Amino acid sequence: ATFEIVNRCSYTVWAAASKGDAALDAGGRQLNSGESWTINVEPGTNGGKIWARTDCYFDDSGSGICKTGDCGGLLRCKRFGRPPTTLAEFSLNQYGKDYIDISNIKGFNVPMDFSPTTRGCRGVRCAADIVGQCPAKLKAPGGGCNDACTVFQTSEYCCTTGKCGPTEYSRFFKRLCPDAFSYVLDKPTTVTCPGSSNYRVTFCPT
């Protein structure tokens, strides 16, 4: 499957693509404002994520640090990134279907649109100013708006027992971005697309 990753932000981002134990395609790349990066994702990929990283410094060997979304200091991510990270999530060719969603479960750093470029399903978007509106206790100094599980590490926010409800913090993310997951047991906002669809992830779509 092809993913086109487009940076419409006025600032540079470092895109990342991983399935948690391996890079997807090259795993990461710098995207200046306006740049597009096309990656190929193997069919059947389960649990892939794409996210943006902000304020990165990397040396010639691809080693460095980012203020949001850092994946163990590598330009080319093999693992998932440190919150806060707005997440495009996907599982492809699962019994004939693709499933896509945007998640705020690991916080929010950059607004995002996640849309198919082939026919047969709709896209999802979280483009509100969550960082500007972020509650004081969730604000991350590096930038971004953390989720409550990251900040407070309780069974309720992290849903560790498999029973948890919405919270004041999850409802904040949900109020600004209803089409993104706001906590682990949120009513799902997954979209079902035809198997082997292609997609575009746009940072700062508005």
From Swiss-Prot:
SMART domains: THN. Coiled coil: none annotated. Disulfide bonds join C9-C204, C56-C66, C71-C77, C121-C193, C126-C177, C134-C145, C149-C158, C159-C164. InterPro entries: Osmotin/thaumatin-like_sf (IPR037176), Thaumatin (IPR001938), Thaumatin_CS (IPR017949). Keywords: Cytoplasmic vesicle, Disulfide bond, Signal, Taste-modifying protein. One of its GO terms (cellular component) is cytoplasmic vesicle. Transmembrane segments: none annotated. It is found in: Cytoplasmic vesicle. SUPFAM superfamilies: Osmotin, thaumatin-like protein (SSF49870). Taste-modifying protein; intensely sweet-tasting. It is 100000 times sweeter than sucrose on a molar basis. Belongs to the thaumatin family. This is Thaumatin I. It comes from Thaumatococcus daniellii.
